[PDB]
Amino acid sequence: TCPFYKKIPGTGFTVDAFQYGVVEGCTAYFLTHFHSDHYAGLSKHFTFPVYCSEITGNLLKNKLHVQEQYIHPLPLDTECIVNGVKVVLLDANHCPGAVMILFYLPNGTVILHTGDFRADPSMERSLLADQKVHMLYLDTTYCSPEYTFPSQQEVIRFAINTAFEAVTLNPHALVVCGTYSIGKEKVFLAIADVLGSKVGMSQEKYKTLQCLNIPEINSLITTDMCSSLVHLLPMMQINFKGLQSHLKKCGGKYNQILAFRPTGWTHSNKFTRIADVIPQTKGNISIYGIPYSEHSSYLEMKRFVQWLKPQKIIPTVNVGTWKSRSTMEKYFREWKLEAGY
Ligand code: NI
Secondary structure, three states: OOOHHHEEOOOOEEEOOOOOOOOOOOOEEEOOOOOHHHHOOOOOOOOOOEEEOHHHHHHHHHOOOOOHHHEEEOOOOOOEEEOOEEEEEEEOOOOOOOEEEEEEOOOOOEEEEOOOOOOOHHHHHOOOOOOOOOEEEEOOOOOOOOOOOOOHHHHHHHHHHHHHHHHHHOOOEEEEEEEOOOOOHHHHHHHHHHHOOOEEOOHHHHHHHHOOOOOOHHHOEEOOHHHOOEEEEEHHHOOHHHHHHHHHHOOOOOOEEEEEEEEOOOHHHHOOOHHHOOOEEEOOEEEEEEEOOOOOOHHHHHHHHHHHOOOEEEEOOOOOOHHHHHHHHHHHHHHHHHHOO
16 A cells, blocks of 8 residues: 555655555656666556656666556656646756656645755756745655765765776776666766776666666777676675676686775764775775765755755655654754754
8 A cells, every 4th residue: 555655645646656556546657766666566567657757768668668658758847737737857866867856736835756866056056946845755865964975076086096096006907896776877987987998797787778868878888898897797796705706707817806885875984084995805806885875965955955945844765663753853843943944
């Protein structure tokens, strides 16, 4: 049974609600982005209309084989009418194709659903600037003040400088980057670019990347592993055994691996600056955990919400425990009292 925080009142609409069977009274199913916890239940046998971005629609068609007749892609930043209701899709600054959705209810209520997002001050000059929002369905992933991490720009600067230094010292070092979903593509693209290489990967991952409208992509990726000195592997393989085994397969082309695990937040963020991050090393293998987040930090979240001044907030993440729920509701009230709405 579909939970309440996935239904939009006064509409026939649900958001990221594909794992509950046919939802009573749902006439349109919105998908905010192509991450498995959100698309869970879509497949080629789905026969209701799906509304989403062009990119998300590319992945539904090619990866999950959803039939074209049920995929309704919408352009960003454009007022659109769905089943008698005005909607706008906005960039969520999450993974490729990820959107927030503004719903203009027939009774005059305005609702913003963030999907997954990383709040940014640039959002204060989108189409959100122009009108009041009554209800906010908020990505509360890191809604607590211990959740700090650097900008994405700082993290990429660290990774490029690290990779470039290592490979310039040793031209026989291989760089490996972990992945388990879309998002965070800048990590491996930035490093390949500084090294003058293409990124090598499996056919299945290359296929996924060909759906994402990245400019000049045919210039940056390849399935020819032998022509590439940046390789992508599944995240699960980014450990000493997995990497040793990979290094065996490269046929004595390489004698060292430098590997990156982009995580979200880890507790080593409570102590160590990005500048000061160090790898775990065993022999000729080193592994760096880097905190590349595609969700709001606590401070970025707070600033967006205090700018927006919603009358009601409904969290969409960390909803399963009373302690989590109580924690979030305390922060929302602090924010409201400090800013005066
Ligand atoms: Ni996500």
